[PDB]
Motif scaffolding. Sequence first.
Motif, short mmCIF file in Angstrom:
data_model
loop_
_atom_site.label_atom_id
_atom_site.label_comp_id
_atom_site.label_asym_id
_atom_site.label_seq_id
_atom_site.Cartn_x
_atom_site.Cartn_y
_atom_site.Cartn_z
N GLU A 97 1.17 -1.39 0.02
CA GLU A 97 -0.20 -0.53 -0.03
C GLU A 97 0.49 1.10 0.34
O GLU A 97 2.20 1.34 0.26
N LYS A 98 0.39 2.28 -0.69
CA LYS A 98 1.10 3.43 -0.71
C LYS A 98 0.00 4.47 -0.40
O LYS A 98 -1.27 4.70 -0.80
N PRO A 99 0.96 5.61 0.55
CA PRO A 99 -0.41 6.53 0.64
C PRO A 99 0.05 7.31 -0.77
O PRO A 99 0.58 7.44 -1.56
N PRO B 187 1.51 17.31 -4.89
CA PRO B 187 2.30 16.22 -5.70
C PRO B 187 3.58 16.64 -5.77
O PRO B 187 4.54 16.50 -6.45
N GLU B 188 3.76 17.75 -4.98
CA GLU B 188 5.70 18.20 -4.89
C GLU B 188 6.55 17.49 -3.86
O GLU B 188 7.33 16.98 -3.47
N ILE B 189 5.68 16.96 -2.49
CA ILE B 189 5.89 15.95 -1.72
C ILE B 189 5.12 14.42 -1.77
O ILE B 189 4.53 14.20 -2.54
N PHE C 262 8.59 13.93 2.25
CA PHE C 262 9.90 14.18 1.32
C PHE C 262 9.38 15.21 0.02
O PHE C 262 8.70 14.47 -0.63
N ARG C 263 10.70 16.44 -0.51
CA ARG C 263 10.09 17.14 -1.43
C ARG C 263 10.82 16.27 -2.53
O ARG C 263 12.33 16.10 -2.92
N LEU C 264 9.80 16.45 -3.72
CA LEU C 264 10.59 15.43 -4.55
C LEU C 264 11.84 16.11 -5.50
O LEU C 264 13.06 15.80 -6.27
N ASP C 265 12.10 17.44 -4.97
CA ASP C 265 12.63 18.63 -5.41
C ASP C 265 14.46 18.58 -4.49
O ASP C 265 14.84 19.64 -4.64
#
Lengths: 354, 355
Positions: free
Chosen positions: B49-51, B56-58, B76-79
Amino acid sequence: MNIYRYEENPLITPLDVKPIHEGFEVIGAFNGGVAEYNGEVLLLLRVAEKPVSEDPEIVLAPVYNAKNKELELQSFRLDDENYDFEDPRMIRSKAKLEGFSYLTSLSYIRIARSKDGHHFTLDEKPFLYPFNEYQTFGIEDARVTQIGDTYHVNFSAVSEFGVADALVTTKDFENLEYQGNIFAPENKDVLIFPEKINGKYYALHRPSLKSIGNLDIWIASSPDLRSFGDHRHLLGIRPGEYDSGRVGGGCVPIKTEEGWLILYHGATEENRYVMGAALLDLNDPTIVLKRTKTPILEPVADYEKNGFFGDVVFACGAIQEGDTLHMYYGVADTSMAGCDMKISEILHQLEVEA
Amino acid sequence: MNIYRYEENPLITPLDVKPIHEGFEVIGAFNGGVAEYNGEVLLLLRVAEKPVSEDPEIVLAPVYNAKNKELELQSFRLDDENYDFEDPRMIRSKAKLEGFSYLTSLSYIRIARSKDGHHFTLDEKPFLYPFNEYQTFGIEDARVTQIGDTYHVNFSAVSEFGVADALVTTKDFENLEYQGNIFAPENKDVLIFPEKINGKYYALHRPSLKSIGNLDIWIASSPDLRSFGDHRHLLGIRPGEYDSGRVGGGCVPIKTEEGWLILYHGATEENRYVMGAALLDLNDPTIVLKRTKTPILEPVADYEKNGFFGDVVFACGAIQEGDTLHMYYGVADTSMAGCDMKISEILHQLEVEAK
């Protein structure tokens, strides 16, 4: 605290040991396991021999071919853009700096004995020399736990298949029985506790982990000192402290009225190695009671700071004589040293700092 | 091989399973261990399972907190330039692409049961869900070995301390006894041999190695199926072959007249996963007698193709009925499939290709 560094330190250096392979030089006699036998102190010296090349542009890696039963040499150019030679212990792929392709020397174990604890004589021949497919890059860092009449000599077995820990048992240091790889790769710094504890044997160990997990001390139980299980995490690294890079078992656990006293090694990320201590519950050694905040031994003498891999003290055994510990340690991955300390004073440091 | 793939494949897909965590999505119901109990086939499915992040940046790491017994999601931030999010399974430090700091999913085990081997119904609730400090990132890929009346359910225990392999025993799938981490990290693909063999139990395993060593199958012995030793290297990778990248135990070892038959998985460096076979000496399973040069099962049906990195079949167990093996396997990292094949054909391929 009282650290009595022996006047004769370093007790045994590469100058005291002649190489057994033609074309090789002894670069270390170190990290000795420690036993008492027939009235003498035995050090199970790790002797590291390096193949010498006359051309400074080329280095050699020694590999024992287990199939053929002989030593093969792999050559490298130091300017090979695919390899890194900056760690003098290893020849590393640039794309895998976290491991190694080859080592720069091949180790085996050779006994030295002493009547007084200070002056040592080498046995004539090697004690354990690579003898199977798990040991092609060397046998290293032998520890010794005596339980009754049986000495349990366990050591790193390094090969292309990984770094495993293997066990030989003996009552006399002459007739040896091989017991296999007691810990699967990747592991080392295995210390067997010196008695059965509430119906189970125990050992410290130190998984080295690719994906996740720090270089931490673990513990396992065993019904027979051949098979091990119920693996638990025991002592972890501490960021910003003397043991921020890794920890590992050092000496055999020492039974005291306060708990099992663990004299372990710690290193920073820059590979400065010191000794520290911890105390485990007497009855269930999976429980940690106390741990030092500052070292019990650091690399401060010149033979501890300067050598093949400097700034290292690395105690792999000690002999207890009442409150005194006669502790023997590798220095700078080069030589052997001795010191005396007191159990009571280590215990006191633990109480003060914890 | 003359494989018979089940008409109903894929048997179980993420659409068949509702998430147990609020807000999450089921992304896999796969790699199922296999047992027979009380006249039914049991699949011990790994459900991942995935949250879902509102932002969508996180991305969120679904971490179990063992003190509080609930999830504590980590953001966590994607950037964030310290991290690499290119492997969608993991949040990796850029300085350690060979490992991970977190997983993007959390797995647990849930049982599905079938009378006919083809049509499965989920147990109402999970079977094994993270319950200690060794399982904070999930319980994965459970295998099952039945010895007499005791089922040995062993599985990957993922945490910040490493990937260990842990054991639960049970005679009814209801009362479970925890037996600790049977293999230290870093290990998985542990398959317990289904009989005591000349005075010792045995288990396949698969050390994952930081410094030196490939991803190779090992074996160990045990007196009691709690402690293991005499570790030995067994099956190594093979450059240029279907198993050039890694190998690991698949199904529980199958006793034949010719030896122990090991249906193992292999992958290339390009992440295509297949099943192969090896045959071990019957009396000393540390000895390898034969190994396939080509696979026994490969990803060719549509539902077997398009994992995130490649095509995948991944068999984690089978039920023997005479010469027939009812093999269940993970497909494409998401779902379950079933197939039948003959043991005699696998032995025959072993013979032919070993020559």
